[model samples]
Target: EVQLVESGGGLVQPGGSLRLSCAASGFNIKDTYIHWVRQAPGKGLEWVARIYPTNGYTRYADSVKGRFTISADTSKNTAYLQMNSLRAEDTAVYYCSRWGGDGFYAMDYWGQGTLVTVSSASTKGPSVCPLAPSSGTAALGCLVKDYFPEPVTVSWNSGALTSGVHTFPAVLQSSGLYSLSSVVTVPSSSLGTQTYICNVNHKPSNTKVDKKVEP
Candidate 1:
């Protein structure tokens, strides 16, 4: 049930500076640690920094030693990354992950990466559409489309009623946006008698698009 949500996306100009934010929920920053990682387009991941909030024990990679700073505010359960220098090569999806514990282990939890394009970017929220249902047991589908950047989340309502919720990866459209689809099956008796909520969480803009489906 732990969730780490990164702040909104960034569209930065070359030579510009940027501040990245990551908020922690279902956990405490004072008790654990947060690590920063990034990946360039089609490139492998690179370690940036790690910060232990309680003791202020911080570690930075030799590459980002001077230009990057990682800190935290335990009271707010938030971690931050500051980059004083920006270049096109810095374009990548940055993520914040939590170190599981003191034992020998890798990061166990991660945020849905916050995209930071050094040159430019977009944050268009998805348009959620619930398809019509058929007779008998219904296979209800929800379509989330026309969004920018990568990665979006969809959640179904009525935990007890919704079953077999399946979601697919986002596809890149010709317009440079993204689209995702999710479907769930409901009992025939629940059709129209209950409402299913399609909640699309677009992290780039820190906004949510919700569509009510009556099947």
Candidate 2:
């Protein structure tokens, strides 16, 4: 029943500072540690900072050591990340996650993430994730990259046939561009024997990119 809600992300000019907050519900903030992570558009994720509320111990990534600060407010049941000297390279979707410091080490819960654009926003691939079928279902991953100004529309042609679908938060890349990833799962019986379409509508580009994958 634990959920982390993040906010305070948007456009920030270079050299400006921003503070992002994560409000936790269904649990006590002091009982567990809170961690922060970020991902550049079209790039891998990076761990930024973490705070152990119990003792107020904090750790930060070397790359952003002096520029980033992680802290918690026990009275309000929230955690915070403060960043300074913002740059286009620092633009990313920052997420707050929870960890049980006693036993489990892996990050099990995550916030929806907030996109911090230092300056930027594209559409790229509707490719597959390893392209496979497992347990009677196949999952497809579509990546829409290098677009700007938020609010992109992503739809699948076979919603009735889908088992589950998720469109991730738009990420602002270091190149001053933005990207997003969407995933859809369908029955294995339909793969290589049917068709699926990933529809992307980016208003800033005034372009609709449709990718059709077929048998």
Candidate 3:
């Protein structure tokens, strides 16, 4: 079976540092681009960014062009997602996806999600924990990061998210790598399963990953 292996985990508290990975197997990493997505507690999914394994090129969602980064090693077919200055709200499940040459917007593959919980400790390093409560009303947000030279967008319920404001911030890592982070807030009162989606708007094919929050 085709698979994407992910690494790194911990309690993701505010002002902490975080790093994760997705390594592809049973596929040609060079022919495809890797994408990262996040799902906050009780909320929909968000598009974080994408990355090209053939080259280290990447693109982030307009909302998160500053706080996260997507990187890849051509020889290893492994991709990475990292964030710094974490917050309690940053806790959520992170995923790695792949889009065929059909374009960067259509994600045809996905990895088992890696859960990243933002706690006072995770803010210091890599960590993981079981899904837990994030905020009152269960309101959650999501984001995607890309590592390619292409235009991309994140969508929910087959439509663009218009109910809330999207934010992107620049993140400079101590390793000298630059990245971006996207944040969107939604009312927990309306979030449900299969109601939210993260999509790339491109040609030949459109790629998307979807998730829904449970009550």
Candidate 4:
């Protein structure tokens, strides 16, 4: 059995930096690449980036290229993910994943998730709650009840999110409002950190914000 161990906990204050790790056990470290993913409270999953420890190769989703980094130490048989310039919106769970193809095609494996919450602890305010409180929760449910009509989307990129094609779409509500969300689980391997995105295209004509994840 392949296992991934993650560390960190509740309420990470904004402007603070976070470093998490995914250690691979029961598998050959050099045989696969790693990918990272994120999910905000009550939001969808986003791809951050990926790293190839065997050769020190790395890729970031276009949307989160500059905000995150993926590194690995073959000697320890582990990979590391670091995020900087933290914001409240960055609070979420992150996971480590593995690629199954020759060029690190699509993610074929994944690890158990690690939760990270980002907020301002001192005078910065409270942490945002999860988007869904129950199984029936929908993206539109938050907007209708909370009056937040903002549209959100998730993206994926190879080199940099902005430079590559990330796939995600907006979810429409019967009330004429819009929202989007997603969850993906894959297999496990050696490579570290794969980039994914969440994009929201609003009526303002192509105005959108994205979130990135690194496994």
- The top-ranked prediction according to TM-score is 1
- The lDDT leader among the candidates is 1
Off by over 4 Å in 4: 101-104, 122-215
* Each model's lDDT: 0.82, 0.79, 0.61, 0.59
Q: lDDT: which is higher, 2 or 4?
A: 2
Ranking by lDDT: 1, 2, 3, 4
Query: Can you write out model 1's per-residue Cα lDDT over 104-132, one digit (the tens) per residue?
Result: 35888999898887755556778888876
Off by over 4 Å in 2: 120-147, 154-215
- Worst 10-residue lDDT window, candidate 4: 138-147
**Comparison by lDDT, 1 against 4, better one:** 1
Indicate whether candidate 2 or candidate 4 has the larger TM-score: 2
How much is 196 displaced in model 3, in angstroms?
A: 39
What is the alpha-carbon lDDT of model 2 when measured against the actual structure? Answer: 0.79
Residues 86-159, model 3: lDDT tens digits: 77666778888888665455887888787776644212211111122265344344433332212234454456
Root mean square deviation (Cα) for candidate 1: 5.2
* 1-215: candidate 2 lDDT, tens digit per residue: 88899998876778989999999998887888899999987799999999988789999989899999999998898999999998888988999999855688789899999988786223233222222334466777677766665657777874543458788898867875667888777777768676667777765446777677553
The true-versus-predicted C-alpha distance at residue 214 of model 2, in Å, is: 27
Model 1 residue 82 CA deviation (Å) reads 1.9
List, residue by residue over 165-201, the lDDT tens digit for candidate 4: 3234445456534444443332333113343434333
Worst 10 residues of 2 by lDDT: 123-132
